[PDB]
Amino acid sequence: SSQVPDVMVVGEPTLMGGEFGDEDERLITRLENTQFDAANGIDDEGGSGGHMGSGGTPEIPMCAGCDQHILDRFILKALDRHWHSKCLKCSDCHVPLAERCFSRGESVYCKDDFFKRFGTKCAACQLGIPPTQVVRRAQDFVYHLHCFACVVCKRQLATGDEFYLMEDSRLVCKADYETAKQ
Ligand SMILES: [Zn+2]
Ligand SMILES: [Zn+2]
Ligand SMILES: [Zn+2]
Ligand SMILES: [Zn+2]
């Protein structure tokens, strides 16, 4: 009975290959709003009719992330509500989100960081691993193609290469294992 101990070996690199799905989360809806005839939007009080009358408008829906209400043409409806163009930026990245949108933890986030921060990534440099790239994952967790190496040899381990997984997440060959602790 020759059964090797808790040992492993690098194999064919592969990834989850998903990149999330726009259909999953409710993306921003670019549509023409129907607020082109409410309150005093147009500058000055004129144009057809002459002198009109429109003061405060209570019980009116306010722009998502704003103090007043919407009254423009093109509006982005997302997160079960209408979110302005400039009022739809990532609270963290603060980058222009004029294409997609995301919500989580009572805050509007983007999909970019959702994959890295709220997804899978390298367990070495905390970098965001692509969606379907090509890399080898350590048993359960995933690692980098470059970061991958030995604690002593400091050399990457390609398919076929035998490496051990330390309790503190560390790659160690056979000879390095015993020499390391065992
Ligand atoms: Zn706004
Ligand atoms: Zn973001
Ligand atoms: Zn890394
Ligand atoms: Zn080694």
Which residues are CB-contacts of 36 (< 8 A; sequence separation ≥ 6)? Answer: 71, 73
Give the number of other CB atoms < 10 A from CB of residue 128.
15
Q: Which ligand is nearest to the CA of 129?
A: 3
Phi, psi of 29 (to 5 degrees): -105, 105
- Annotated domain spans of the chain: 1-182
Q: Calculate how far, in angstroms, residue 166's C-alpha sits from the geometric centre of ligand 4.
A: 12
Angle at 24 between CA 22 and CA 26, to 5 degrees: 75
Question: Which tokens go with 8?
Answer: 């492993």
Which of 73, 88, 75, 82 lies closest to 42, judged by CA?
73
Which residues are CB-contacts of 12 (< 8 A; sequence separation ≥ 6)? Answer: 136, 159
3-state secondary structure the chain: CCCCCCCEECCCCCCCCCCCCCCCCCCCEEEECCCCCCCCCCCCCCCCCCCCCCCCCCCCCECECCCCECCCCEEEEECCEEECCCCCCCCCCCCCCCCCCEEECCEEECHHHHHHCCCCCCCCCCCCCCCCCCCCEECCEECCCCCCCCCCCCCCCCCCCEEEECCCCCEECHHHHHHHCC
Q: Which ligand is nearest to the CA of 138?
A: 3
Taking CA atoms, 102 is separated from 11, 19, 26, in Å, by: 36, 14, 7
For residues 9 and 111, what is the distance between their CA atoms, to the nearest angstrom?
34
Which residues are CB-contacts of 162 (< 8 A; sequence separation ≥ 6)? Answer: 7, 8, 9, 10, 173, 174
Q: Calculate how far, in angstroms, residue 48's C-alpha sits from the geometric centre of ligand 2.
A: 45
Using an 8 Å Cβ cutoff, are 45 and 52 in contact? yes
